[PDB]
Amino acid sequence: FVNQHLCGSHLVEALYLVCGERGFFYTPK
Amino acid sequence: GIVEQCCTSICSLYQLENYCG
């Protein structure tokens, strides 16, 4: 589900699912 | 950053994991 254009809340949702307990940092710049 | 690699271009699992903790 990660090999597409992921924008906005969809990208943040992807990071949440992929990273899990590791957490993540979201920096759109 | 992540937007240029995953939103304006097609994302990858490798790119997403670059931002995990």
From Swiss-Prot, chain A:
Outcome after substituting residue 10 to D: In HPRI; Providence
UniProt-reported outcome of changing residue 22 to Q: In MODY10; reduces binding affinity to INSR; reduces biological activity; reduces folding properties
Domain of life of the organism encoding this protein: Eukaryota
Protein name as it appears in the record: Insulin B chain
Species, as recorded: Homo sapiens
Gene that produces this protein: INS
UniProtKB/Swiss-Prot annotation, chain B:
Disulfide bridge map: 6-11
Annotated protein name in UniProt: Insulin A chain
Origin species: Homo sapiens (Human)
Included stretch of the parent chain: 90 to 109 of 110
